[PDB]
Subunit: 440 residues, 4 copies
Amino acid sequence: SEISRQEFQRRRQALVEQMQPGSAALIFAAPEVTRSADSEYPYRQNSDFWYFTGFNEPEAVLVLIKSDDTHNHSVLFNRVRDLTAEIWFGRRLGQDAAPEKLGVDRALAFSEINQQLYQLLNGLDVVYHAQGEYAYADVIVNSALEKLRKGSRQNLTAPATMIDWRPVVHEMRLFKSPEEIAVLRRAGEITAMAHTRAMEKCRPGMFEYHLEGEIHHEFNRHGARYPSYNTIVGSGENGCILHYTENECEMRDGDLVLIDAGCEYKGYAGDITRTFPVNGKFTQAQREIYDIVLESLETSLRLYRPGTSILEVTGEVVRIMVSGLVKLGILKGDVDELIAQNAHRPFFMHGLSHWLGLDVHDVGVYGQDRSRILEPGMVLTVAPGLYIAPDAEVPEQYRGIGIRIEDDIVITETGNENLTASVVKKPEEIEALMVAARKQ
Amino acid sequence: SEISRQEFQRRRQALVEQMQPGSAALIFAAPEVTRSADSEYPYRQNSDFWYFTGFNEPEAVLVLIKSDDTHNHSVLFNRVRDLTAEIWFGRRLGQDAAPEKLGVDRALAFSEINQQLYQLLNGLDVVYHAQGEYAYADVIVNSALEKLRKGSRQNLTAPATMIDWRPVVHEMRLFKSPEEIAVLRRAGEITAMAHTRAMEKCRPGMFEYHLEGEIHHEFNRHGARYPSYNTIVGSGENGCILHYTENECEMRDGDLVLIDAGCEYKGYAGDITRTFPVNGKFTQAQREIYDIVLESLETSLRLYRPGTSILEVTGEVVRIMVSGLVKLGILKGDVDELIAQNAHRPFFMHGLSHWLGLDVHDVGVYGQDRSRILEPGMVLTVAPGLYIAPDAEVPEQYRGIGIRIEDDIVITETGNENLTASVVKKPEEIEALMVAARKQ
Amino acid sequence: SEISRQEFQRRRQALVEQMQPGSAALIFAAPEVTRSADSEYPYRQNSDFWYFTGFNEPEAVLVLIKSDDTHNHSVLFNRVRDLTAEIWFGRRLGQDAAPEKLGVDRALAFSEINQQLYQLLNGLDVVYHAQGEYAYADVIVNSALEKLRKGSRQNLTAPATMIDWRPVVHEMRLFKSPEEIAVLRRAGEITAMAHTRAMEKCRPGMFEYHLEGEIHHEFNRHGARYPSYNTIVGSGENGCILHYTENECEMRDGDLVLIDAGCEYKGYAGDITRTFPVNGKFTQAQREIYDIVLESLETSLRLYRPGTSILEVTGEVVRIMVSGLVKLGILKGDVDELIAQNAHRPFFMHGLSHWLGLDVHDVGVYGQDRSRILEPGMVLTVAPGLYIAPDAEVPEQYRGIGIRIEDDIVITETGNENLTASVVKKPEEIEALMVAARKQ
Amino acid sequence: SEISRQEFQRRRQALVEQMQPGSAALIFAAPEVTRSADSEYPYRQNSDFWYFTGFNEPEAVLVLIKSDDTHNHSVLFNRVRDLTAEIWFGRRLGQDAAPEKLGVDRALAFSEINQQLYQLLNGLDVVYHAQGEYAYADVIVNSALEKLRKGSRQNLTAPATMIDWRPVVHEMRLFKSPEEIAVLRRAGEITAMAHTRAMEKCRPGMFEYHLEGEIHHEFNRHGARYPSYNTIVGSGENGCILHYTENECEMRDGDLVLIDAGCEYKGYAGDITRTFPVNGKFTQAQREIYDIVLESLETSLRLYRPGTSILEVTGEVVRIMVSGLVKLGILKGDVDELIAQNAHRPFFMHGLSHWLGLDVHDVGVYGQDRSRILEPGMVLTVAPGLYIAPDAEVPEQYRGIGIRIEDDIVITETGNENLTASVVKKPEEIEALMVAARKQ
Ligand SMILES: [Mg+2]
Ligand SMILES: [Mg+2]
Ligand SMILES: [Mg+2]
Ligand SMILES: [Mg+2]
Ligand SMILES: [Mn+2]
Ligand SMILES: [Mn+2]
Ligand SMILES: [Mn+2]
Ligand SMILES: [Mn+2]
Ligand SMILES: [Mn+2]
Ligand SMILES: [Mn+2]
Ligand SMILES: [Mn+2]
Ligand SMILES: [Mn+2]
């Protein structure tokens, strides 16, 4: 699966449709980023710039100009071609090939941007710009507007209105197209395959990072070179740390391991969590906590549909959790009183669901307390968990247990589709999978 | 292999030994670095801060104070402990545990640095600071010195002399200790194992990135989670691009593949290049170029020793190259005239050798044209290559061939030790290794 | 004459009337300005901040909030009272006295602005801000908007639209109210008195700066402590330099002296130029150039009225000038051809007229080539001049002559009113005035 | 009096003498400074740049290069000549005329500084630079050093040591040469003439600013165009505000007026304070406070000499003050106990003496509590005062009285010379002077 030329074109048009007449929108590429000294991290394009271009170079700027309600055109600034820079650091699109390759009307050298950008904004009424996203962008934009402001004797005028395009663009990204869902579907499959492999490879005596290596190799073999976020492999008490990425410990027989990992496929994020016994067999105490988290996930997957909200499903999860914990003697008292006192918060201290897309924690307005009514095309995670601290004042057998189970879904017309159900989560199925692998 | 507490202590003392009396040296940690939106790249500590601390947190500053020629002490600023930040993002050293863990006299909260740093520099004559390394550091340091400058009514005075410690510290890093060599030795072994595996797995129809996945998995299984630089896998004409990292192409029977990859083990970089046929059998034309590059490497490995230089060995390599190319009809004319006209430069257009250590392109003064006389403890690469452009005006059979062969060495008392010789480079040995694997 | 409380109130309301509902306008005070080391120049408030407040302290910000089409309110941030800062640097308004004194609804400490401003902008749709006017303002505003942008979990939202209020406010300042005209009328009288005094005091052997001292003393005695711009006193060849402020030369019998000087009365600028003989008697050559400049001024004063433009009157001046110069043999050829070739530009190389108000070069849109149709209430200068370079290739007697004559006017319903006609400009009247004084 | 070419040359050499061999010192000119919109304050050169050049243009940089202990040379960067910029804003030195006019070896265009400065610092060991003085300077200097740091392949190296030249240069400025003393002597005379005139012109009903106008006119007529600081004219209760510059009040019969004003002559500051009755006749209550302040001044003028300190003389002044106040019933108790409790501080709350030179609050180290031993050539103020608040709990007749009397002196071999004694300070002499004038 991939995103077509035509889809990138549609997105630009959909933004232009919402822009005021006599305006220009400016979307900047991400800077390169130092890892150490002269070496750089692998390049990651800005998600919003990527969304309208599918162009993976730095030092580029998309300018969409709306002259009026039926006339508009696109200008790309990008790096000029250069034999020496390309023998070294690899090929560039340049200006000649860009109009056709990327479907833009004009392409200009990024090195000429300060000489050209103000001429493009001259006489417009509005400029859409994401101020404070990048410093190099703010410098370029403020420098253009100052030229126009001070150039009234050269008959130049600046647009007096500056509008943030992020709310508009993030509201667009919140609703996935059929193509986007097809890509995210494959990101979910790739990620599931990686998690199944981690379960099948796990043995006591391996280190947490060994499972990270297995996962990343699986991402890569399907053409997802990078993860969408830093992989979490928290065995034992490390599973009580929500974003544990040290992954430095020897995995011990008797412990659970919590794996939170997701690939990045064509820009889009997978995001799955699975928790399982290192030795392939859940203890009674481990099952008791795991069952509460699994019921939470399974109930949420039933409930999520158009018309409800993350807040409303979260409330049901809290009920399931508080009731389960009371039955184990981890909480004491009346369920409804405990719910009203948020007595689950020491054990479940994060949100159930976030938007998913070009970023793992994707853009889009949630509403107060995540009360926004869900609609078809919204893509989100379902990620209940329970984390009992090593020093919690609860029965000994629950102390130092961290369990999360997380799936990725898309809201459909009548309910939801689970993108990550191809990796098992029922305990009996986890155990069968690990036994099968240990034979072979 | 690892670096001991005592070794970190020795390094600090070695720097303090060179500092003026009545001075303080300020060494800042690296900032966290955004990959996209709220997600961050895996943290990489500043190599110089790492060198004196082996401490892998951001928002930390080492202050070494030399009161006089026998009195000095160390102060660490680091992140305070915090239960909520640690349930989320994982554990912190804090101030209580830091003196013992890191061998410093005092530890203070990074959040108090602007209230404390000027009190530490008050009345000193010199401050050692790497100006322009990090903006957040320059702001902290300039803000401290301004307080002191303007506080003469509170009996405060600023050191009038600011010295860059980088030349001193980089001259220290240039000469590896026995422990550093032991670590780099293991980085070389780990990297060699990865390159052997890539050769053994390569088949036509696999993609360049598939070999990247194999390599990274091998790094990880030996406890080197990250590469020291972005992995290069350039098959066919892609091998003519020196830092090709797209690794996006299907590998074709008939083509060579150039793999440039290195692990990062305990901070230290491996750096190996091997070029081999995708189908396991070099053609006559491929052998003809490969043999020139291999002779270049083998001769350089014989020559490198105390007393010579990168420049002097490079001159021998150029002779070997120009002579080989003339014999193939790729160059025409008198060898010595061609050498004097640098007629190899269209085909070999980079340096033979760089320093290697905590950075792949390691710190240390090279001298003019890399004429610095080599001494025991210097660690460096030997990396001859020949790159014939797809459109070079040479016999057809050499066009689009990129070959590099690179090993890592340390200068010893009587010659050099090859850290990366455990992966094969003689063509007959490459071919045997790939045939053996293809059986199985 | 002065500006009333009620007038400041009217101005704010007139701006609020034009603002969108659910918006806030932010108007910042000028920073203090170093002259040398710890000493500062006399404080000059930002003209726009002054316009809405008549408040002459630094570190102040006016926030006008339009909740909707009938509800709005004002908030002032200003310096808190402080006994020690006031024993030293003199009295402050503070927060208690500000609402009544300045007619604002609320007053808050400037030192709390970063804690309060974002709460004032929370949930608004638009913010009016003059971006790039002051750096300290941009930092305050961007810091507030970032808090709101990132505070969606605390139910905060930033206005997505930022609008420059300068075009609106400068269009307001362009049309003077009856009170403003009364003040500018007195600024013109004060300035005229100063220029008359300079003529009456001038003797050969005095220095240019001596006339500057006379002028400034006259400004001050009428309660205009500061000039509106740096005083020009260019005798002889110095009169060929348009903004000559060195005023360092001995004034010579035989030379003309050009005095360009203006007071600042209650914020408003006077701006007069008079040129006269140092010895009180114009030569034939001096009269010949002076008469052309005077006819230019006198014709322009007849012509300026609603319905015409600076461009249209400038064209008449150019005709008068080119014709006069041709008659003197300073230009050669056909008048209309010379006009079409802009042959006056070596001698008259600046505009005839600029807007006048709180700034000497006052705000307001001129239109292309200053073609904007004039309307009652516009206040402007009329300032023709001719400058013949010491090395111009013209008859010897005109070389090194600089003459400008400048008056300040306001456009009325049927023509214009001359605010600066109380200082003489007809040569016979200049000469009588200087003879009378010499007796003283 | 003026400062010779030779003296500027001597100063540069005296600095070069103290510089390390293989170093360059960088001294930047002051920026132009906005008063409002496009209008600028009168230009004031940086005192340190002025000290070595007597050059009064912006955008200039003096580079003094010490190659070794007998070889050094000077380079000026300054504005290029330009006919259009000079017809408008007046003449420029340029590069051709600068070597001779300013006694420098080479002059280069300021517009080429980023292309040339790094070539001047290449290969030096030390750079003397006043970091944080001006932002435009820090940008220029850091940009040069970065070029050198990163240009090792072009055989460039940066000086690793940066030293603040301000301590050295300010220690030079602290000791005035015979020429400097001659100029400061004339600044004292000019300032005294102005203060005598203010006394002679004062009548009840005049405003405070009227005396400011008289003073400034007197400065100007002697060729001191600008004051060295903003003039203070505090009548009545305004005299209790130390730096009262509003000067807005009608002067009332019965009140004292405190005038603090100083001219700037050839860069050097006069600084005199005189307090006198508005109506020409001191009351008993006014005399009682005035006599304490005058005894303080007269005793200090006797005491100041090489070997003592500002601290030591201040202690004598405090004794005189506490004793006087006790006799008036303004303080109660034992003199020595009151002195030990600093019981004078409500009434005398500033220092007695500051250094005087190119800045009114001149550069130079004071020592702890101003304990530095005085030496011939030091120039300083002597400025005791007593300020009784309108609401002080003291006998009614002393409330709202502000009196300061300040003279400028230079330490000589055997004592001091009073530069400002030509304006009267004994009350009987003040009264005679005002009576004489009233006849005018
Ligand atoms: Mg347990
Ligand atoms: Mg071929
Ligand atoms: Mg003449
Ligand atoms: Mg009284
Ligand atoms: Mn997750
Ligand atoms: Mn998630
Ligand atoms: Mn390599
Ligand atoms: Mn290498
Ligand atoms: Mn004028
Ligand atoms: Mn004017
Ligand atoms: Mn004073
Ligand atoms: Mn003083």
